[PDB]
Design a protein around this ligand. Structure first.
Ligand SMILES: [Zn+2]
Length: 240
């Protein structure tokens, strides 16, 4: 069982496009009057989330420009600028935000469509400091649209997410925790497939198990309803 990264470029582009359409269907379900209400993400109204998804598309466009021109263009000018623009976007009227989402989506797709073969492997830097090939934007965008589709609070679920994306997320999140020395002894178990996703090593093992969608929702900090613990009590997972 392969990861998103092993997939051919065309299939990764399709998954990103599918996730975007999935996210857009959820946004379409939300009413303009509901933008000001809390999203499923603490501290963020739907407007904040909707703005963020658009600014992320724009940030990924920067990496693709960097890739195609060879001229360094970071995802965001600065952490402050990233936060400040999300703050600004969250104040915009609903239709303005729907237009921003639509246009930012369209522009990122064009960026991908016009990317040269060599540019796809050009090294760029993520906002988190990772050195990756430009093609990583296909994965990065997929994480955003498939997961934030759920955060919109309409009808999207982790169960809606293609397994290849869920498997890659389970591995990535636990790999991130491991790199940070987080989640000592904590191991996620995709019970149906008997696949373990360990974090940092510890003396007391705690196995949190469920279906793949269940452990990913859990690892993503979005709930424990789909998992159970080997100790009878599910701990709060390390942040992500
Ligand atoms: Zn995000």
């Amino acid at each position: 069982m392969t990861t998103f990264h092993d997939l051919p470029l065309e299939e990764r582009l399709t998954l990103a496009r599918l996730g975007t359409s999935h996210y857009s269907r959820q946004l379409s379900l939300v009413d303009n009057a509901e933008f000001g209400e809390h999203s499923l993400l603490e501290g963020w109204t739907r407007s904040h989330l909707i703005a963020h998804v658009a600014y992320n598309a724009i940030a990924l466009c920067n990496l693709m420009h960097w890739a195609n021109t060879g001229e360094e263009t970071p995802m965001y000018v600065s952490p402050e600028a990233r936060n400040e623009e999300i703050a600004y976007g969250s104040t915009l009227n609903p239709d303005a935000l729907r237009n921003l989402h639509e246009h930012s989506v369209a522009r990122l797709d064009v960026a991908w469509r016009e990317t040269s073969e060599d540019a796809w492997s050009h090294e760029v830097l993520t906002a988190q400091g990772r050195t990756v090939p430009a093609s990583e934007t296909l994965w990065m965008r997929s994480r955003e649209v498939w997961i934030h589709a759920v955060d919109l609070g309409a009808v999207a679920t982790f169960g809606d997410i293609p397994e290849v994306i869920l498997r890659t997320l389970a591995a990535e999140i636990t790999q991130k925790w491991t790199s940070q020395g987080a989640g000592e002894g904590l191991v996620l178990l995709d019970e149906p497939s008997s696949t373990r996703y360990p974090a940092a090593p510890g003396q007391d093992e705690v196995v949190v198990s469920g279906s793949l969608a269940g452990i990913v929702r859990y690892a993503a900090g979005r709930g424990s309803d789909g998992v159970t613990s080997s100790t009878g009590e599910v701990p709060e997972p390390p942040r992500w």
